[PDB]
Symmetry: D2
Subunit: 283 residues, 4 copies
Amino acid sequence: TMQGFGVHTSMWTMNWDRPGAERAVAAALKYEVDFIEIPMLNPPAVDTEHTRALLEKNELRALCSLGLPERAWASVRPDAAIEHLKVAIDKTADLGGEALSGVIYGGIGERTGVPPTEAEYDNIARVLSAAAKHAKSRGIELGVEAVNRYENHLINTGWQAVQMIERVGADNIFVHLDTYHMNIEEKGVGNGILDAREHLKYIHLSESDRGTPGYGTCGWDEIFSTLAAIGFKGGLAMESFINMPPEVAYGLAVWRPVAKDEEEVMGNGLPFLRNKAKQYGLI
Amino acid sequence: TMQGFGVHTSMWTMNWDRPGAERAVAAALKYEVDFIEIPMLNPPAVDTEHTRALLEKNELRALCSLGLPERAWASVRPDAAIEHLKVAIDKTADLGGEALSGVIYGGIGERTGVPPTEAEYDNIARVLSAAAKHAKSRGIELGVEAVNRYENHLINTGWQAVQMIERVGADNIFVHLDTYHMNIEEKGVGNGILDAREHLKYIHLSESDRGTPGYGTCGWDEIFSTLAAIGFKGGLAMESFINMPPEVAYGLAVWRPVAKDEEEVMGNGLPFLRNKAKQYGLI
Amino acid sequence: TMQGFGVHTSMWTMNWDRPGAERAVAAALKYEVDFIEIPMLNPPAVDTEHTRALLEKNELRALCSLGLPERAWASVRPDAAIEHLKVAIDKTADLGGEALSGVIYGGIGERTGVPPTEAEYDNIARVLSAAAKHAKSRGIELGVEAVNRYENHLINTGWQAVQMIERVGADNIFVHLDTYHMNIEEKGVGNGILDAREHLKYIHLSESDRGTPGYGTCGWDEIFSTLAAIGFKGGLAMESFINMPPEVAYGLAVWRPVAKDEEEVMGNGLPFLRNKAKQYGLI
Amino acid sequence: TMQGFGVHTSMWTMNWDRPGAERAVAAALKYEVDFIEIPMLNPPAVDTEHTRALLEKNELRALCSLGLPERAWASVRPDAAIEHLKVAIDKTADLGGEALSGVIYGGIGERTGVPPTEAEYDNIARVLSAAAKHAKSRGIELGVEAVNRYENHLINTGWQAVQMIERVGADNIFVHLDTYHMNIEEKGVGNGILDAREHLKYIHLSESDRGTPGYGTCGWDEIFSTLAAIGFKGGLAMESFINMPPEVAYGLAVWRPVAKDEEEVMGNGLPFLRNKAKQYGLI
Ligand SMILES: O=C(CO)[C@H](O)[C@H](O)[C@H](O)CO
Ligand SMILES: O=C(CO)[C@H](O)[C@H](O)[C@H](O)CO
Ligand SMILES: [Mg+2]
Ligand SMILES: [Mg+2]
Ligand SMILES: [Mg+2]
Ligand SMILES: [Mg+2]
């Protein structure tokens, strides 16, 4: 269960190869965060012992996220999804990760053009029940990230994520919210946190255009006040798509730069988020 | 403990005489609220039995509020303050009221020009302990309303109000917040609710200029999200100074109309507030 | 140039057929709006005389909007695009419409998977000049609506829209903003309006989740203040997808109801927006 | 008229005596601001030659503000008001200041207990006309600052400020707004800027609780969007009562620290404000 402030490492590498891991860890120490979120584009390619040693040497904690590739979208190909998640779960555990979170129930770009069906949710629930048991056997948790309607048609709101978690009824699955998605989906941004309050262990603090937090349209005071009010003691992870490699940015509809450079995003956005966290007593 | 929506009868009556009481109860039923807040400007003159019958006949609940007159400000004249609050407490209880709230620790217009001192707080503590015991004997609670720096120099934030309630140590004093005062005093409006969460039983939903809720500078979404997040189950009371008699309006620095008339304030503000209450699941 | 308050007819109908036209117009009368916005998604299916007659009979102005079907995306099939727009232009004029607006430059759901090319914008420019010439021949104007990154990759912000319009050189193309889209795309929502200032004649007052204005995450005070500040005088139109036009469903990604029903949205959203327009003095 | 960013010197000193002036000007230099606002509350006590040399040495511009002492309130004692303003104006000019601004029309803490009257405003107009003449003779301008109802009963909104400027008919009096006061007085904070637009040349970017800008309740996005929309090119000045000049302490009502210290307000507030100025393109 994460604690404090962290950063999504896409700001310094989307590929967790050896130089990428080193560059992300160095950045994390520079900005003095408590944890990093490691994206696993290609789980088999990850050097678990290098990463584990980096994290322990520099007293850094970690979790991992992914989205399922189309060959393994849980809604329609659940056995492939179980297989893909078991690999990702095992890499996460081996490198010292405490959790695998993100769109672990489908992939960026699912859309049937109609509302989500019961059969789609049944497959997801089966995929998630299997994956959670494999996660508990390796001592880690699983996260369900609500994402906006355009990225996935199945889980877009805090309350939909909670409804999936109750179906499965596994102890070790938590909700993962993202203010960039909440800014589109939640009927008042605080409502996402409210609906998910019993299961919220992680939140992406991302600006409305994936740019510099504080300089967009997210209602930060509402967000931080509501987190304080529910007693949120999970992970506060900054996410910006700045200096994300172009072929992974184009995939999530980044057609133009989200901010000038890392030095605007991290120099303005991290102090802003940490000050707000202090202001509302989360620290 | 109060529950649901209510209205400060300021809008129809600042003198709770017999026809004022009738008019205010009539308005309450027209807007179909759950309770009214009766300002007790002159407690001795209140006809308790008349009001009690009005409330019971019409299945309305009620509480009362005041501020201490200068001859009885608790910080400097605790014995007079005690005498004044006993009369108010007894009139509140006799008319069927469930609490006496407001600036019961001081007066509107108190200012020494320097920070509140420990001797002032000792006097207030002694007054409040005596007042709360007298209220327990009559079966009612007392509320300590945080008001802004210009109205009183002693209790301006939820955290100061909580500190006083812990000093006194009495079970039947709760915190009373006001969004108009909070908009000035709280370092992030939701922090006043957070700080007072253990003790908060009543809140005035008043716009930043005492006009029409929804049409000023208050952070309504943060306020309602935070109230829902702490699980607030007490009273939601609209306060606007529209149609307040002139001499009372001047006492509170109303130098110009806050709003066009009651049509705007209750016709626009009450639906806005009840819609927000519904939006964030307080209903 | 449209003036006052209007509604996009998805409030009341999926399709602009004869029974849909009859019901939408009757509903617009009931709420005393000044204009309706008619989706022009199947031009050869619209009974223009039946619509024109209803407009005159009921003292109702109108304009039309569309997105281009993939067979005529200007980005890539410019010649098809020009010819589709000439037809839509002609039918807009025939029924009494005063402009054709929206995503007239491409698809709702158009995505190459990479950033837009100057060749794509070269084709759009050609399409738009040709179209604006034909619109001039029928006495109507064209509007270019900026939409978010997931619905189109070419024109996402007021500033992009303005650059396109300045390239084309037509006197009769205006910018059309939508608060739902700016909520995602603009770095501070008022920046969309500021950048579009010289050309902004139409805006969709659409909530962040396409639901009821005032009950999402859009920054309405900033929006209305900035519109007042720039002297906005064009049209103010609600857009809530209670009913979803079939040809654009896939791209609009409404997978679940945006609000309880049509009466919630007009009953709560329209007073809220009229009240904000009066609050900020909008012409 | 001023340009760029400045600070009210109460950030760094209580009194504009000689060691205060040295401390304030040295602090200003570390933050690289363009100007400082010097209180002019005991005009005979200001060493103008020492201040001027400090300002020119360190390439800092300056203006002054004050509130009138009760012996010289223009409402009631216009002849004394004129004589006090003539001396304040001369000292402002002698030290290199470019305007005298603030509550030049009355007192910080002035209240009759009743609403303002024509006789009061007629006296203010007579005083300001004489003052503006004397200001023109020394080559500086005068500002009228709207302050909230508790600090003064005469000029509380931008529209009231403008009305006084037009009642006086001078050509060298501007309007001075303050977000801390607008947060209470304006019916939507942008409305204060809108109403004052033709005359607005100076604004106090002060947080709702006089603390750190960005960490209170002011609607900064609406403020900066609206300032950009009207083409604001005047001074942008912080005002945080880290130190309280004793002559106005009673009226300003700072009873508890507004923030931890000058390092917090300037280290977090100034970058927030600069970044917002950049975001909305005032630069
Ligand atoms: O906001 C919109 C959806 O992106 C646009 O208004 C559409 O262009 C419109 O519905 C077409 O009728
Ligand atoms: O905001 C203010 C009053 O509350 C003004 O800035 C004062 O005029 C200033 O503090 C006087 O130096
Ligand atoms: Mg995320
Ligand atoms: Mg109150
Ligand atoms: Mg639209
Ligand atoms: Mg000021």
